[PDB]
Design a protein around this ligand. Structure first.
Ligand code: IRP
Ligand code: IRP
Ligand code: IRP
Ligand code: IRP
Ligand code: MG
Ligand code: MG
Ligand code: MG
Ligand code: MG
Ligand code: MG
Ligand code: MG
Ligand code: MG
Ligand code: MG
Lengths: 227, 227, 227, 227
């Protein structure tokens, strides 16, 4: 059935497991010249993230089938994930679509903020907006990464007040940090070591979002761009 | 220099001109089976839009050079445009980037609503993170289409109270409609005939956003999905 | 059923029709700086060709269903067409493939030469792996463009001696030239005006194969690269 | 300088190193339903191969600069590699190209064959063709994988008789097999464990070429499709 136990990831499929020492030299891939000095290595190449997101879209389609749902994007680190997910979801649905078929999902955006440098501020800002349009709807939250779990634990709590029919979570990354609060997604791309990552829309004080690969910012980058 | 006369498009390059009778049969390209009955034809295929956006990114990079600017995405219709632009902007910039280079842009979102069915309600609703963070910044507004010109003339008026350094406009489509108030973009993709279009994130009552090509919704489509 | 009347295109769907004056300014799309002076304009952008080829792959899959066939690539002009076709054929087929499914096609190459400058030398030279391996097989010839029809009428004649089960033709372009001998493809992408085109693997004395868009070489280009 | 010691890989950059136990579950990525039972795992995802090929193209451009050279594709397992390489090479060259620039490379194809099942036959068939056009030219051989090294050792020997100016080797994979004869490429994508791989144009008796990811065929697939 459709998932509806936010944070429990009751029937979640295992993600790709990135070992603690997995990764690649920056010289093995295309890296913007000026960013090189601020990264220690490539963790997950752009291409593998894209390939994995395609399977996630397949997993999602398999769970919702033809059931109309609404994708809620958690801006802005979620952009890379969201775009690729929508691309693949649409092709999968539309390729199998028949003349009597109907659209599969609606799309929504919510700006959520809590980080400063490489740490959560323990507080979450939610850019207010009437979410009444989601009342009685199946919503699929699309997020970039679960770290401490505060963003999702909090946002899901916030969502409750809108009488949404069902709440499921699609997340690109899940970090193996001792700070984790236990929040689990229903669809997860990769399980990654405890390092602050940038790239694929994920940033460090608004920097590195344009970096194609998921990389590890080094101490020099953290210091150079510290708030 | 960098554009700073919102609505004047003072030095805008000419857009691709889509003739009044330009278009393609629906059977010439891939169209989701269930959407076929609600479209009269393909106006601009996905591939041409992507190719044009790449050139547009080239033009923008040429104008800004290395000057840091902030892209303002006008949700929800401009998503397709926006993501394609970022992709090309990033590659073009990063391909020529040097070790001593710097990032080129920041990204922001604002949800602006005014349409019901295929007409402007003559009103405007806004939702976004505090726009005061644009003070003293060069901002590039990324929009899907200029129709009556109400959305952009109004939004640009609202932007004035935040002491933004410069305000330029990048628009995918500009419709040749007698309703046009004269607002011109600084970067425009295509000039199209007076028809309500859907696809490439452009919708008709939230429908067709997933349609890959820019098409014309037929009367049956407008009737079927009337609000 | 599967086509088997080479040159008749008995049940071919109509191609996209490119009017005699259709095209775009070179400044509307990305063009390699050094090629600009040798092209008069863009006839068909890379993106439209890709979109059309996807539909063509859809048509081919629809005709063959699960019948195993062998794609014969006519080097060197059809490379762009060929690779794009394989990509789409593979995804369309594999997306609907089931556990009990089977591969859909085999791939082969034949180099056929006959042009010098912008004209057919009226002769044909062939180079390929033994074509006897096509005996009893359904073969789909993948070609870039039908001009006079000499290449395909001749090659198809040569194929007769190898007891091929079925011979069908997939052609990206078909030129509306008074020189046409009547040979028709079973799957055709575009019908274009009488002009020598380059780009998308199509060359002029080995030049312009890397040009992304199908363009018209101007006289300066033909003169500069005359053999 | 331009490499010219075929098989020595004198200044070759280290490739991406795929450890003996590296790889992913077939369920982590998109795998054609009917192929699943014939593969043990995903070795290198399609996306990482594409990302790596982009850097290889960058490495090549950096070595040849504006020096005209000729790419010689070793058909047919080489297709996937070749296509992506040409795409990236052209963009890199054409993005930095200036009005006075000129094309960077010519393209050529040579069908070479030696395998039966998962083993070399110790013999090499070369589809004859006048290679005199390469006389005094810098040629870049583009091959899919170095296994025993017989194909390249032999083909390079064959090439000598054509008075080519320079001979360099670009290879996507290099297998860590005890059967290796010592032949090294000048540009190499990945170093992989000793397993017969299929996908990305690489086959097993003409099967699996359409598989997007580089995977390991299991004993059942080898038996099922044995010659
Ligand atoms: O390692 C990281 N790199 C980049 N962004 C982040 C984030 C951002 N912070 C949020 C997750 O944080 P948390 O789970 O700690 O509440 C997400 O919305 C992310 O966009 C966490 N960890 C990282
Ligand atoms: O023909 C159309 N198709 C789809 N959306 C629209 C719009 C939406 N309305 C806004 C432009 O409206 P206007 O210029 O009329 O104020 C844009 O933000 C669009 O998203 C106008 N015309 C169209
Ligand atoms: O206008 C053109 N531009 C580029 N190549 C060609 C060709 C090449 N010539 C062959 C078709 O020739 P024909 O039909 O004249 O025998 C194809 O294999 C093409 O590669 C014909 N016309 C053109
Ligand atoms: O593991 C493999 N999978 C698929 N093809 C191959 C080949 C093919 N055989 C040639 C390399 O073999 P070798 O180096 O042993 O002469 C290349 O041309 C490849 O296309 C070798 N190993 C493999
Ligand atoms: Mg976030
Ligand atoms: Mg962040
Ligand atoms: Mg809008
Ligand atoms: Mg709208
Ligand atoms: Mg030809
Ligand atoms: Mg030619
Ligand atoms: Mg081979
Ligand atoms: Mg082989």
């Amino acid at each position: 059935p459709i998932p509806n136990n936010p944070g429990a990831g009751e029937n979640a499929f295992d993600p790709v497991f990135v070992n603690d020492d997995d990764g690649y030299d920056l010289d093995s891939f295309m890296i913007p010249a000026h960013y090189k000095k601020y990264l220690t290595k490539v963790l997950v190449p752009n291409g593998v993230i894209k390939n994995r997101i395609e399977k996630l879209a397949y997993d999602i389609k398999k769970v919702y089938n033809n059931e109309e749902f609404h994708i809620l994007c958690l801006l802005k680190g979620s952009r890379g994930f969201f775009t690729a997910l929508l691309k693949h979801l649409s092709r999968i649905h539309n390729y199998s679509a028949v003349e009597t078929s109907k659209p599969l999902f609606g799309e929504h955006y919510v700006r959520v903020k809590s980080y400063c440098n490489d740490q959560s501020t323990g507080t979450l800002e939610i850019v207010s907006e009437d979410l009444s349009c989601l009342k009685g709807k199946h919503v699929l939250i699309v997020e970039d990464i679960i770290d401490t779990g505060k963003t999702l634990v909090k946002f899901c709590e916030y969502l409750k007040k809108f009488e949404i029919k069902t709440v499921a979570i699609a997340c690109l990354f899940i970090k193996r940090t001792p700070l984790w609060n236990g929040f689990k997604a229903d669809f997860v791309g990769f399980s990654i070591p405890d390092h602050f990552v940038v790239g694929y829309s994920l940033d460090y004080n608004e920097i590195f979002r344009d970096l194609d690969h998921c990389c590890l910012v080094n101490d020099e980058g953290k210091k150079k761009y510290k708030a």
